[PDB]
Design a protein around this ligand. Sequence first.
Ligand SMILES: Cc1ncc(CO)c(CN)c1O
Ligand SMILES: Cc1ncc(CO)c(CN)c1O
Ligand SMILES: Cc1ncc(CO)c(CN)c1O
Ligand SMILES: Cc1ncc(CO)c(CN)c1O
Lengths: 392, 392, 392, 392
Amino acid sequence: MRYPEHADPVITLTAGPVNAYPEVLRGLGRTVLYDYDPAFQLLYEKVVDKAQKAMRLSNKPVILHGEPVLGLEAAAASLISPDDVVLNLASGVYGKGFGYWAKRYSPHLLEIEVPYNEAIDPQAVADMLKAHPEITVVSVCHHDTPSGTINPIDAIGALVSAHGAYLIVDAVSSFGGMKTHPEDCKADIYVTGPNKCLGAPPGLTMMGVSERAWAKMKANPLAPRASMLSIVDWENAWSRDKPFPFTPSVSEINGLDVALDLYLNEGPEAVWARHALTAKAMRAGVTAMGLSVWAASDSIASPTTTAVRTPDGVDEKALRQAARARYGVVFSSGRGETLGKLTRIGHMGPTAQPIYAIAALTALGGAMNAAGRKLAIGKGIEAALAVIDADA
Amino acid sequence: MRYPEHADPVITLTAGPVNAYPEVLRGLGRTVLYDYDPAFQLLYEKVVDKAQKAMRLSNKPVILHGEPVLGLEAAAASLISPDDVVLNLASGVYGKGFGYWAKRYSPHLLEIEVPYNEAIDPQAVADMLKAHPEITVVSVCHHDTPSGTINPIDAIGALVSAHGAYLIVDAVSSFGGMKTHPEDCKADIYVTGPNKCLGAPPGLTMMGVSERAWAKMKANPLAPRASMLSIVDWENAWSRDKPFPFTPSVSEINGLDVALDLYLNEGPEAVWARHALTAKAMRAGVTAMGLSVWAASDSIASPTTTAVRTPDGVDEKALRQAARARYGVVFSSGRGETLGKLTRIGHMGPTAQPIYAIAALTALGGAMNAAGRKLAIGKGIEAALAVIDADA
Amino acid sequence: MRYPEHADPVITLTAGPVNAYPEVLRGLGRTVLYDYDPAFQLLYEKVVDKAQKAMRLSNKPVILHGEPVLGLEAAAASLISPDDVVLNLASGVYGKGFGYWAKRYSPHLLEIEVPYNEAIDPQAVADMLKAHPEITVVSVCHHDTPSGTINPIDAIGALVSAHGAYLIVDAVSSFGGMKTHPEDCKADIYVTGPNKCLGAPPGLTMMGVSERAWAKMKANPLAPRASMLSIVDWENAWSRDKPFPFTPSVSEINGLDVALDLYLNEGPEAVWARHALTAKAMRAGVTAMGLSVWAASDSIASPTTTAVRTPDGVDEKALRQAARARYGVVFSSGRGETLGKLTRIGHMGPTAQPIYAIAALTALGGAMNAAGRKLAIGKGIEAALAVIDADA
Amino acid sequence: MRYPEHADPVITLTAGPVNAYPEVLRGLGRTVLYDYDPAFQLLYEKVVDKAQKAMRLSNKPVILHGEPVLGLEAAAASLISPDDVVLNLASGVYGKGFGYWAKRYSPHLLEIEVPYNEAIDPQAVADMLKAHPEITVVSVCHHDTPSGTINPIDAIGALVSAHGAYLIVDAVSSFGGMKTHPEDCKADIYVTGPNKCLGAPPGLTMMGVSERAWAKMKANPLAPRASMLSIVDWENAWSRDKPFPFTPSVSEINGLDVALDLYLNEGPEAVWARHALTAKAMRAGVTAMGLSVWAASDSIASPTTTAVRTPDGVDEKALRQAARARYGVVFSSGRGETLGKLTRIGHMGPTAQPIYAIAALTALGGAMNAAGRKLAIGKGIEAALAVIDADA
Ligand SMILES: Cc1ncc(CO)c(CN)c1O
Ligand SMILES: Cc1ncc(CO)c(CN)c1O
Ligand SMILES: Cc1ncc(CO)c(CN)c1O
Ligand SMILES: Cc1ncc(CO)c(CN)c1O
């Protein structure tokens, strides 16, 4: 049998979007209230509170009404002034991408770049900060999703703070899937969203903003105001007694409310543990069947996405097409420089369950063997199962 | 009895958000596909196709992934450059507000302004264009929602086309509720969304873009690129064979898909008819009970919102609070310069049914009489019912 | 304009089914678990607990997996033995109907019957019990829905208990809409369901069973066992550690779980108050516009349904057809003997809000006037509004 | 990690209930119409029409408003009278169970019984009918779910028709998952429902009734009338111009409407193919890892459920508990005489996709090996995958 391209798949095991939690799907269908209805004003405030709790934040996170690219662009536009000296850290497509936004707002850009299967060395950051005491802003990506690798943002954040500089963190594809919070890495702007590990669709940004970041932005006359890019205009919008700069995405708020409930109710530590275990099983299976994990070392592989290096001679696009057509299972391609070079299996929110690693490994192996590889699929499944069983 | 502020209301009869069509609420809970899944790529293309059909467009409308303030800001930022001389037409909050964005992108701003219960006079537009050959861009709001009034955008658009200028039209709260289309008014940029008459929640922008506008925006070094504010980045994203500049709001697209099906299946003309009838009945009831329609004339009153002038001396905020607390019915305040001057009752999508005008009249009259007015509520209901019963 | 018969209506204001609460609609879409999954076994037990709390029951209510006709037939089949002497009380279609089931299970049937707009006199019950000391079972209907009238079941229950007889109560269309509980009327079998005032669809029965009723049924070898009609087989099915006699209606259980939450969370007393107020406003409006409430006295009119007598010369079916076609509002016909003689407007769960009485009165008046009546519709609305305002 | 019993599982792979199709879950949340609303009357008629098309029926199927045990009990109660001599065919729990209801309605019962891993032999049926001209009714179960085995009902039905007897067929867990229709087996009563292969929750019965069966039931003084158990009461209820004996399960009808659309739109043959492939892959994997399929032969194994024999010495209850606790995968126990003897993995509707066989095999193998077995799980997965990859 074959699954047609036009028809829905059986299991979406991508690095996001994945299907939302079923409760979130129902939540998206909640009553759409007028945004100035008192019941909505209360709800919105409560949602900010839940987000604050989930992010372990000492102050209120800002919700912005676009998917997280909005938060990242807004952070650059607001926190980077023309006299700032920015150090951008690039270990993949998103990290490198951010430097282009930094250069938009300040002509002074320094960069540390590593190969797109490696991680930034905190010591290299320290060496750079010593060489360049003029640095005032540092930007880093936690999980550079198209690479499935993780940067040590807490160690990096400690060094940025030691140098009196501001830290911008992209944690879009890590928050909620592993231990990470604005406080942990001493972030001044910490950008995430509910559309990766939290199991909601794309549409909203969740942003931690330090009191020092608030001061800097509010004193910056170039920071966007009366603009979709404005962070400062949303400063007090959490309050039931305050207006919204523009109309909030009411249904997305309903979805986020449920996503936060699910996360908080399950227990963040338990949620992180199942992401890590699913990924660990996946990597063990990949290696056992004769494939290679993309990450330069196991230690930097993401607990929320496994990137698998495309073997020589294998057409990666055809591979994904075959996994879907044969088994109904959808994986992600790479992006930019990693496009065509790897395949990504997400382990995110609803898909962060070890049984999904088993399904993924089988479909990946099956498609690889259809492409003429001679993988030991059974061996891969047993290796993955051994990881699950050893944690039991 | 009293309805608590924290509890949900019984009927939301605002000028938006209103509760979405029940089908749309269910639609929002459809499968969230990976955005590069072939089934989603096809779905997105077919949603753009539906929007093109709904908008009677000769070319593809652009969907932007924020609520229509994004469309309006992006249009200013992309189409208006400092060489342009902008004529902004202002008869209300949104019309005047657009001038602020125009001035951000060009120092040259001329305006025709009328009080916020009037419509722009096409003779004044013709005269202004004649006196100012230097005008290159003209902006106008179709339904300036906080006033419940309509501008004659088709005649205005023809004058603008004859002059040789670009036209930017805000049809956020008119499209889908009355006859209007980019073609009808020779729009170069026509901004709307599904969150007023189309009965979806806030989150997306539907934008008609003329071939001439495309060329102007793509030529302009100052037009946003690699930005939330970019229209040009999204030119080819409708196509199943093309990537997305950033991740689309997948669940909002599911909602839009349903909203467009409802509209096209019902028949746009039939849909416009019931908006207009609901509004006509509303206005008749308002006048018969002893209140005044805000619009300077009945002829410019919107078929998608009835704005009712607050009797001098009545506390409009307390009035709305009373309507919700006594009867569970939610109305909109004014906004900006109409705040405190009037109350708005929306007739939009799911609320554009004449029986809702009856409910609105009773709650409005009841709240007014609680504030010491002596309205003839029965007379109001009978006048509204006569309109319904007379409809041919 | 006209609403086609094939298309959905705007507002369903019948005596049930009405549209479910929106939360219940979402709840019906919850995960369908295996009935022997431990999470479902726990859920089912919790649902019984919630039902017990809502019914103010000293012991567990039984949920049966058919709409309440099942409970009523099962009660007759189980509690009525061939040597029982049954007194059936009939003030309408359902009360009279029950006597046919009683006669199925015992040849000994006595009856008190009153006209179908009147109520049973507790004194007549007392007189009958004195005349016939051999009576062992008495059956009564609380709200005989096709009549929109209420029997004094607590007073009647006290007299039945005084005579040592068992009491079967049909509270299908009263429970949750007014103060009534098995304990209040000393019921031995108390049959209701969530498909009237509780705002869920039809499918489930909620049955209070006294310990004395349990003893009687279990000792009755003719009581249905291994049967859809079995109550006794479900005795222990509430327990997470016990099996289900047959497969429960899992999705209906999900709906009931939400319905109970809504009721308990709002506060039963507050729920009853809004049913009573909506009905009170409705009756005041009916009378003021020149129509007649069917009930012989206002005191016996149901707080959950208003039955309106059809004027001479008016085609009641055509009337309902016109209310729907003209205004999109759906009312109930009568049933059996009341069919063609009255129209019913329900005030049940989601429709038990006074603003719906206003909509109902307008559509009823409008349709009556279309039929050549000359009703004072405005006067009716004002009378209804006066009732609402006097409770404020 | 461990999945708590109180928390939801990851994948329900039981022989039903399984989670409903996502479209059905949404369908259950459709508007609940008044049952006498013309739009519902039409909808109900069109749902019966869809069921008739799905069942390839020459006449209208009857929908009864309880899960299919209602259909089976009602069929016994209506079709079997004490003059009848019933031949009950028993190869499992449901087959044997039906004999109990037969005996309730006629004292004359003959039976052909085989052990609960076998199928009824059509030669034995022919011989029995020959030896017993007095047989007037024959009952058979198509898929006796607690055994995962299939009886040859088409050949059996032809023998029964030749004999001149009525045939009652239980196709609850076969219809929609393999080729079978009332016509195919000359059924006089054919009982099924949407809660197994059709991917809806429990609550409705779909019943094929022959013209001959109608005449027999309507003649029988003992057939239930004015009863939950009545088939005869429902004969004309499909028609938009006819009343309902009691209130239909409106939300279940919405669910059924969607389930039938899914089935008819996909193509019944295509649907049967994927059930059969999923099952075939499952059986291959079970055997290759070292376990035994319960069915006496592969040829009688159901394409909608794989029953796996418990290795002697293994605690089957603890096994299922382990599969859920370790892997979040839910399997069915046996029932009655198969309880403790085997574990069942359903392949039904939404779970009838081959990738689910892979997940089931891994969780089953993992749980078995945790109980001290030494299964070749990798080998099992590879054998299952080979079946998938071989499918022409
Ligand atoms: C690492 C990362 N950053 C930012 C974004 C923008 O939302 C994405 C989404 N691909 C992402 O994966
Ligand atoms: C006329 C108008 N324009 C733009 C917007 C921004 O979405 C709104 C919404 N108030 C509006 O009513
Ligand atoms: C009073 C009454 N009793 C019993 C039933 C059976 O559910 C109904 C539903 N019409 C009813 O209204
Ligand atoms: C074969 C069979 N018959 C009847 C029923 C009653 O619905 C079931 C459900 N276990 C079944 O599996």
